[PDB]
Amino acid sequence: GLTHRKFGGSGGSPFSGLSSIAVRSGSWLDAIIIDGVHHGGSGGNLSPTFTFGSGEYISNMTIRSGDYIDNISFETNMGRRFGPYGGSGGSANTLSNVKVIQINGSAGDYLDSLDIYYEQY
Amino acid sequence: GLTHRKFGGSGGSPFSGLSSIAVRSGSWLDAIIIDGVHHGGSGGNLSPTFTFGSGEYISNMTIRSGDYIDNISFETNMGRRFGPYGGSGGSANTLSNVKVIQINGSAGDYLDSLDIYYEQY
Ligand SMILES: OC[C@H]1O[C@H](O)[C@@H](O)[C@@H](O)[C@@H]1O
Ligand SMILES: OC[C@H]1O[C@H](O)[C@@H](O)[C@@H](O)[C@@H]1O
């Protein structure tokens, strides 16, 4: 039963807990770095860090994956892009016309899985 | 429509994009710090940073709020606790038997509001 609730008032500027993304990747994903927090191992190469602007969110996302995450790319509502980073194995799946709220997952020395929470438009 | 999708396999240790929380607070909340990213102003006192364990999430949460956020406390599924931090004003609202996925909000010099995304069990 996924849902959300607002608390408090109407002032201020909006912000998101999903502030920046980087990855370590080779032929698959070694790690995802979320808001500077490292999730995964130390292999592969480190990508640049994508920092979302105010009012910017992931609107499209392509993940190549098998038993492990092989490739990530995304696009934002402002027309900016991240990736593709990773390899060409696994199967591709796309989220289209979304707003990504959160990225959880599972990682060891490599990135096993991602759980993407989002609104579908 | 709020939903989620899983990509990848079953290995590794679970993690969350929402990996640590701290606040600045006096009589109300000046800021919330999510994964080290500062959201709000410089007033009040800095709380310690709660860092979630793998597979640990907010299961219960009490927020005191009015037109601004007044107080935050939460408990995790592992029995650990954060807060209460803040003042005693506003009205209290509780999320019970949940799994918090994301904390967004709105802030200027203080914490105006929070948008809490969560699973309701
Ligand atoms: O991504 C998995 C693996 O792919 C490549 O072989 C290299 O870049 C490694 O360092 C990396 O760990
Ligand atoms: O909480 C709002 C306000 O409360 C108190 O008066 C002080 O601790 C301030 O520094 C703080 O900004």
Domain boundaries, chain B: 18-121
Residue A29 CA: nearest ligand 1 atom is: 1
Residues 6+ apart with CB under 8 A from B82: B21, B47, B50, B72, B73, B74, B75
What is the DSSP code string of A21-84? EEEEESSSEEEEEETTEEEE-S-SEEPPPEEPPTT--EEEEEEEESSSEEEEEEEETTS-EEEE
CB A35, CB A66: distance < 8 Å: no
| DSSP-based three-state secondary structure for B60 | strand
CB contact under 8 A, B6 and A35: no
- Rounded distance between C-alpha atoms, residue B76 and residue B21, angstroms: 12
Q: What span, in angstroms and rounded, lies between the C-alpha atoms of B58 and B97?
A: 9
Measure Cα distances from A45 to A36, A108, A110 in Å. 16, 16, 12
Q: Which residues in B2-44 belong to E strands, given as ranges?
A: 2-8, 13-16, 20-25, 29-34, 37-40
* CA nearest neighbour of A80 among A104, A55, A63, A105: A55
Across the interface, do A15 and B105 touch by the CB < 8 Å criterion? yes
For residue B41, what are the CA distances in angstroms to A100, B16, B66?
A: 26, 25, 18
Indicate if the alpha-carbon torsion angle B108, B112, B117, B121 is positive or negative.
Answer: positive
Structural determination approach: X-ray
> How far from B11 is each of A87, A107, B29, B84, B87, CA to CA, in Å?
19, 7, 39, 35, 43
Resolution in A, one decimal? Answer: 2.2
Nearest by CB to residue A107, choosing from B13, B65, B68, is: B13
Please list every residue in chain A whose beta carbon sits closer than 8 Å to the beta carbon of residue B1: 119-120
Contacting residues of A for B17, CB less than 8 Å apart: 17-18, 34-35, 102-104
Kindly report the number of other CB atoms within 10 A of residue B92's CB atom: 13
Residue A41 CB–ligand 1 contact under 6 Å: no
Among the listed residues B43, B3, B1, B52, the one whose alpha carbon sits nearest the alpha carbon of residue B23: B43
